[PDB]
Amino acid sequence: QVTLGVLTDMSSVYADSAGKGSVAAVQLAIEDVGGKALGQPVKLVSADYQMKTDVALSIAREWFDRDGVDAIFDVVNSGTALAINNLVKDKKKLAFITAAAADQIGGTECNGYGIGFLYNFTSIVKTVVQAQLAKGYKTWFLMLPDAAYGDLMNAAIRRELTAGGGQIVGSVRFPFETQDFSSYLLQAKASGAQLIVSTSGGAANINIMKQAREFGLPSKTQKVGGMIDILTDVKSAGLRVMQGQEYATSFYWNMDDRTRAFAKRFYAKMGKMPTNNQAGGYSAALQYLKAVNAIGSKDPQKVFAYLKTIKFDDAVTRHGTLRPGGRLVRDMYLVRAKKPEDQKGDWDYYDVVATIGPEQAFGPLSESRCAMDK
Ligand code: NI
């Protein structure tokens, strides 16, 4: 029997964008293989680790040892994802990290067992760089949080923008829990950059976009840009505030007929549209179950080998292949927040305005930081 485990947050700040929704997305994948693997019903368990890595490890350990769990999905914290990555090596189980973007998964910490099946931070940056440069936005100014996420995005943006022929004309860091962003916006405007990039999400990005308007931004010469698609941020803040900001994403519910059909099934269960994390969980679970059934085995080493020979083309994953190190490479998109008067329903927040191919969005196999990819 095949047992799937959804290890997520159902009580805290990622509950709405992963959580019970990620369980529902995995349920939909189980449906897409007739409910069965190896001729038996697929079992599904889930748990809330409350964004505590120690709790996620204790939950996963018992799952593998007592409840027969073969593969786990979601994991919404990068830190927790790295810890789970190291456990599944030890226990010889597969983990599909579909709710965290750490490059280390299928990158420097590749192991044949931790699989990155959403997107990585590098692909977010490559996608915004290439899409914006193609639109003529050459000169950039970065607004970054103080924390490790800001360090990571600063290094990646600077390397990819330069490799593409653009230039950073300035940068600023703001401290934890900033509410007044006037000083940072004034510096961004004075830099003269064509593109002013608010790199974070959450209340920080929401207040930056609110306050950018008091400074006449966007203007004829300067646009405000973003990084990560956080659909629930647009829901909270509204298109009046968010209109015009662009982000990179792996998935948007209203991209095409195939995304919309998946989204309708999801809405029927959850009463809302699926986020890219929840969509990633669907796609990982679907391809995992299809692989088990195709080779007639749930041996992780045999499933992994097989997954490396397939071209993925489902409702969520487009031009997908699994690299030798366990990083999914795939089409990525630039999405733009719509003008409020153009919103036609709940969740109608974006237009897709560019599509970057897998090799371009993730880099050539030679740029990979995984030993198994060389
Ligand atoms: Ni094609």
Side-chain angles (χ1 to χ4, degrees), residues 48-65 67-110:
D48 186 351
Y49 61 92
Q50 311 129 66
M51 308 179 55
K52 287 169 125 200
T53 296
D54 54 352
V55 178
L57 293 173
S58 66
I59 289 168
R61 269 192 252 110
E62 182 163 358
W63 273 356
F64 294 143
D65 296 342
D67 303 304
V69 166
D70 301 289
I72 55 172
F73 301 83
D74 199 73
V75 200
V76 74
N77 279 305
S78 282
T80 302
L82 301 184
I84 291 286
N85 187 57
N86 180 44
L87 178 69
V88 294
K89 163 200 257 259
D90 293 358
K91 304 293 189 158
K92 303 298 177 181
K93 302 283 175 193
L94 296 186
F96 296 79
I97 307 300
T98 50
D103 286 355
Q104 289 96 331
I105 303 298
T108 47
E109 305 295 350
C110 56

Side-chain angles (χ1 to χ4, degrees), residues 254-328:
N254 200 26
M255 187 172 75
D256 63 28
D257 284 353
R258 285 202 284 157
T259 63
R260 287 186 276 283
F262 169 69
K264 186 182 186 213
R265 294 169 67 205
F266 183 90
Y267 193 96
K269 284 181 171 288
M270 297 300 307
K272 59 194 43 185
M273 295 308 168
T275 67
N276 54 13
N277 304 309
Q278 289 157 348
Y282 166 78
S283 179
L286 181 68
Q287 302 299 332
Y288 171 72
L289 293 166
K290 287 182 90 188
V292 169
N293 282 333
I295 70 176
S297 166
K298 61 177 197 163
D299 178 318
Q301 300 90 11
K302 294 191 181 165
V303 176
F304 181 85
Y306 170 89
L307 285 174
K308 293 188 294 163
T309 64
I310 302 314
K311 292 169 72 162
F312 311 116
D313 178 42
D314 65 46
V316 177
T317 299
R318 300 301 174 77
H319 300 106
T321 44
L322 186 63
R323 289 204 163 152
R327 174 47 64 184
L328 170 73

Side-chain angles (χ1 to χ4, degrees), residues 171-213 215-253:
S171 220
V172 279
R173 306 283 196 120
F174 54 91
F176 180 65
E177 271 182 352
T178 294
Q179 282 178 54
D180 175 1
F181 292 84
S182 54
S183 167
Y184 308 106
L185 286 161
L186 289 164
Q187 291 183 57
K189 184 165 158 172
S191 71
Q194 290 169 305
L195 186 67
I196 295 172
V197 179
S198 178
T199 59
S200 71
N205 185 59
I206 294 165
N207 293 314
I208 283 164
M209 288 295 294
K210 287 178 179 263
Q211 295 174 24
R213 306 275 229 105
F215 303 92
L217 295 169
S219 72
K220 288 164 43 176
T221 55
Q222 305 187 285
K223 208 211 232 162
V224 179
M227 281 290 143
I228 293 176
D229 169 12
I230 307 165
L231 191 59
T232 59
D233 286 355
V234 185
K235 172 86 176 67
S236 187
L239 287 174
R240 211 146 281 290
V241 169
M242 307 300 263
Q243 55 185 309
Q245 199 177 31
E246 292 153 310
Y247 321 91
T249 195
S250 58
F251 171 89
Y252 177 56
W253 78 266

